[PDB]
Amino acid sequence: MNIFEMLRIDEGLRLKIYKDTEGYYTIGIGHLLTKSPSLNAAKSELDKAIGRNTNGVITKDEAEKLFNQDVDAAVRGILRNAKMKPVYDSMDAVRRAAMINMVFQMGETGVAGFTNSLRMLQQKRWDEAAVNMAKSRWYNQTPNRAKRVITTFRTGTWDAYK
Ligand SMILES: [Cl-]
Ligand SMILES: [Cl-]
């Protein structure tokens, strides 16, 4: 297991524009197109990202291409963030992957609001962090996913994904 397989499990793959769990237009492996209610606006953001006239449909390869870029951008966002970087740098490889999944889902912005859990992770107080993270809108809205990521931080293993 690795970050790619982990996220491919959490996000799925869809080759046609769809609405995510918050109703925003998305495509591929959890790649958000736009927060606008407009389908047109989304199809336009899609064409710009792919560099062709897609008509709201992409190929698997294109999906995978967006996905690579999006994983990259997530990691780089963490590295560039003064509050996150030292957390991330303090952890083992499995737990870092859990942190990337969160940022991928919620953005740096969303993640950076778990200050208290981040400080607990940095101290390696796993069980406490796990409990604090569960007190969030994130856990309430996408509980099965949130549990999978929370167990990953808690244990340092991939068990929630097998
Ligand atoms: Cl893009
Ligand atoms: Cl869920």
UniProtKB/Swiss-Prot annotation:
Key words of the record: Antimicrobial, Bacteriolytic enzyme, Cytolysis, Glycosidase, Host cell lysis by virus, Host cytoplasm, Hydrolase, Viral release from host cell
Active site: 11 (proton donor/acceptor), 20 (proton donor/acceptor)
Residue ranges crossing the lipid bilayer per the database entry: none
InterPro entries: Endolysin_T4_type, Glyco_hydro_24, Lysozyme-like_dom_sf, Lysozyme_dom_sf, Phage_lysozyme-like, T4-type_lysozyme
Cell compartment(s), UniProt: Host cytoplasm
Protein origin, superkingdom: Viruses
Enzyme type, top EC level: hydrolase
Pfam families: Phage_lysozyme (PF00959)
Protein name: Endolysin
Gene behind the chain: E
